[PDB]
């Protein structure tokens, strides 16, 4: 059911800085105390970030093209932003994949999917029970289904400090879909904090679909409803970075090459 509500408003595309984020581990190989170069599809430094200040008068869920991997972020409280829709033509003829939670565990399904105009998590504000998870309406010519390990999870609305900051990299490569993950508690008013947060190689998916367009999946509070929490989107680029490992085996600094002449001097 194309359950599209009324108050769906978009901002004037608030621009933010990608200051030092999107840096992750390019491989599953330890090193230590080195200055390692790599030419790989990374987020640039400093660049423009399309902010989605999703508030109770701004229901941010448009269609966004993928365009060679995205960087994604979510300043949230109690895990609102579960669910991504990755499709080709975003409709019933599209061999698309859906990435959700059943409040217990990650469920990822790739099939032909009649995509309604606004499916949603009918999440109650005091309770947070996904009763109307109507996402799997129909299923035909289906291909893939994966369930991860179950772990602790919150659903409903909270407030306070910016305890939950999710930073993800969703990267297409050779038919594989790479999904990278890293976490850090922060405290901003409403903007992206500066600082680097390393990611980790969680998921490699062997699907091989025409990843062109994507959307996110929200929790409409029980009439939609949100909180004082927002989320950010940026585009990657085929560039070349230098990483400075420590003695412990952790990224402590990253330097772009294609940014500034000082930066190419540093990585040269």
């Amino acid at each position: 059911r194309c359950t599209t509500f009324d108050d769906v408003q978009a901002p004037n595309y608030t621009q933010h800085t990608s200051s030092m984020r999107g840096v992750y581990y390019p491989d599953e190989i330890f090193r230590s105390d080195t200055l390692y170069l790599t030419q790989d599809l990374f987020l640039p430094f400093y660049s423009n970030v399309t902010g989605f200040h999703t508030i109770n008068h701004t229901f941010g869920n448009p269609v966004i093209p993928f365009k060679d991997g995205i960087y994604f972020a979510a300043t949230e409280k109690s895990n609102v932003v579960r669910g991504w829709v990755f499709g080709s033509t975003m409709n019933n003829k599209s061999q698309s994949v859906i990435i959700i939670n059943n409040s217990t565990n990650v469920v990822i399904r790739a099939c032909n999917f009649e995509l309604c105009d606004n499916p949603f998590f009918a999440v109650s504000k005091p309770m947070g029970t996904q009763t109307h998870t109507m996402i799997f309406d129909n299923a035909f010519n289906c291909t893939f289904e994966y369930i991860s390990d179950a772990f602790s999870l919150d659903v409903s609305e909270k407030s306070g400090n910016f305890k939950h900051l999710r930073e993800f990299v969703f990267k297409n490569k050779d038919g594989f879909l790479y999904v990278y993950k890293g976490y850090q508690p922060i405290d901003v008013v409403r903007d992206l904090p500066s600082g680097f947060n390393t990611l980790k190689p969680i998921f490699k998916l062997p699907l091989g679909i025409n990843i062109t367009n994507f959307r996110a999946i929200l929790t409409a509070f029980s009439i939609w409803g949100t909180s004082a929490a927002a989320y950010f989107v940026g585009y990657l680029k085929p560039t070349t970075f230098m990483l400075k490992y420590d003695e412990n085996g952790t990224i402590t600094d990253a330097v772009d090459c294609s940014q500034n002449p000082l930066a190419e001097l540093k990585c040269s």
Binding site: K93, S94, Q95, N112, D174, G175, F176, G208, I209, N210
Partner: protein, 48 residues
């Protein structure tokens, strides 16, 4: 054996390890057509 098919009408070539299934009414200028209209076919084709 007319049970197996292939596709020969794609707007562009492929990235590696990628699979097209959807029977789109192929027309060289977008154009959702009704085959058998002109330049509006099905990309599916048998083997024999």
């Amino acid at each position: 054996n007319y049970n197996y098919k292939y596709r020969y009408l794609r707007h562009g070539k492929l990235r590696p390890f990628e699979r097209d299934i959807s029977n789109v009414p192929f027309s060289p200028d977008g154009k959702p057509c009704t085959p058998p209209a002109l330049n509006c076919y099905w990309p599916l084709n048998d083997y024999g």
